């Protein structure tokens, strides 16, 4: 019924003011509460009644809702504000409550880097049980979107690939992870095989050999 | 110390029924309405439905109509929330959050959620519960940069999550990066650890991988030598 509509993704300066939106009709209405939701965490009401905050929450998080739309609105944004912003109203044609999609803050300004590589060939355990992966770990890149290509002897090699979506380090950079299986004829009739991480438009590409 | 703590992850087959339970504390539960929403992986909150634990009344969403049923034992201040019958896309965490104070009462304040569960994973897949192969990753030169060596631990093919793993049963903690688990299509995990360590030091000191996969009771310490 009052289908909330957020926008995917917002992203800000450090100590800039965020703006979050959540549109609905006559949604001025009703009561817009905030839920923040940290990776990994459980949600945190940081708004409600439009504008009030729990106690606890700074003072730098405030709302208003008039008309068509209710904005969030967060104040020198700290890179601990980066989290997922949900909206929230209580249907009065059935009690029923209402999210909106939800709303990626991304606090820009970190520092890009390209991926290091590590690629492994199937270690001789593996291969005495019939089986064959080869391992290619990638970490400590910025942004965190990556493509993945394999090659046996330079040609694409798209069956039995499988790839990790990336994920935030501890340091804030991202790592994800390939890996392709194959049989162990498969391995050793190649000269060599070859993972190749595309990032930001450049590429970085190990090599391994079943004979090395 | 107002809190909700909800019961653990639960793995399930398609078909299968679970029921999950959020135990109030720290406020008087029979005063608030308990809700529920749910959060499939990498996607929104969706409010699944409220009951009122003063008289066990309950409002469900549309599409939880039929296969949801929530109850309280107010004896305990206990919400308990059962899933008939999951499917695949049933995959989510699941939280309990308290809600509007006082329910049917003049003073009727729906403030929003203001506390939530910690959330209860719930998991559905046709995959069936099996350990772990660990193999070793040789640190060879090709695995050598600039006088350090990664080696490492492939945990391969196994389900459910979670697994753990640590290095040397604890010591070696500085240059381990275990990588988050790839969910393959046949519906099995793998995941790697890796450390970087000092290529002079391969010879003098032994390193050992050490998983643990507790869904299958399994553990395996893993040595890790040079080619």
């Known amino acids: 019924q009052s289908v909330l509509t957020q926008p995917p993704s917002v992203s800000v300066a450090p100590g800039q003011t965020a703006r979050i939106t959540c549109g609905g009709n006559?949604?001025?209405?009703?009561?817009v509460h905030w839920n923040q939701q940290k990776p990994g965490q459980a949600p945190v009401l940081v708004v409600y009644?439009?504008?009030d905050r729990p106690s606890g929450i700074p003072e730098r998080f405030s709302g208003s809702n008039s008309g068509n739309t209710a904005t969030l609105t967060i104040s020198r944004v700290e890179a601990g504000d980066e989290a997922d912003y949900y909206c929230?109203?209580?249907?009065?044609?059935?009690?029923?409550?209402?999210f909106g999609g939800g709303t990626k803050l991304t606090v820009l300004g970190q520092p890009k880097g390209a991926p290091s590589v590590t690629l492994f060939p199937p270690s001789s355990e593996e291969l005495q049980a019939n089986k064959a992966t080869l391992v290619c770990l990638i970490s400590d890149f910025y942004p965190g979107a990556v493509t993945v290509a394999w090659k046996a002897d330079s040609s694409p090699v798209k069956a039995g690939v499988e790839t990790t979506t990336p994920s935030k380090q501890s340091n804030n950079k991202y790592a994800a992870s390939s890996y392709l299986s194959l049989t162990p004829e498969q391995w050793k009739s190649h000269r060599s095989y070859s993972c190749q991480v595309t990032h930001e438009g450049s590429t970085v590409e190990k090599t391994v050999a079943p004979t090395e | 110390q107002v809190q909700l703590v909800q019961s653990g992850a639960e793995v399930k087959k398609p078909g299968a029924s679970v029921k999950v339970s959020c135990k109030a504390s720290?406020?008087?539960?029979?005063?608030?309405?308990m809700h529920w929403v749910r959060q499939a992986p990498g996607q929104g909150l969706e409010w699944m439905g409220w009951?009122?634990?003063?008289?066990?009344?309950?409002n469900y969403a549309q599409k939880f109509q039929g296969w949801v049923t929530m109850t309280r034992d107010t004896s305990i201040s206990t919400a308990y929330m059962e899933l008939s019958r999951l499917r695949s896309d049933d995959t989510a965490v699941y939280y309990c959050?308290?809600?509007?104070?006082?329910?049917?009462?003049?003073?009727?304040?729906?403030?929003?959620?203001?506390?939530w569960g910690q959330g209860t994973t719930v998991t559905v897949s046709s995959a069936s519960t099996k350990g772990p192969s660990v193999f070793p990753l040789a640190p060879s030169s090709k695995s050598t940069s600039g006088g350090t060596a990664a080696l490492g631990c492939l945990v391969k093919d196994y389900f459910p999550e979670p697994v753990t793993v640590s290095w040397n049963s604890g010591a070696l903690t500085s240059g381990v990066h275990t990588f988050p688990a790839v969910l393959q299509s046949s519906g099995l995990y793998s995941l790697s650890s890796v450390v970087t360590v000092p290529s002079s030091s391969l010879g003098t000191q032994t390193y050992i991988c050490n998983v643990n996969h507790k869904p299958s009771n399994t553990k395996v310490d893993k040595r890790v030598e040079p080619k």
């Open positions: 959050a308290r809600g509007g104070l006082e329910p049917r009462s003049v003073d009727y304040y729906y403030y929003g959620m203001d506390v």
């Open positions: 720290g406020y008087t539960f029979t005063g608030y309405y």
């Open positions: 009951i009122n634990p003063n008289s066990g009344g309950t």
């Open positions: 006559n949604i001025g209405s009703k009561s």
């Open positions: 009644d439009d504008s």
């Open positions: 929230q109203v209580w249907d009065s044609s059935s009690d029923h409550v209402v």
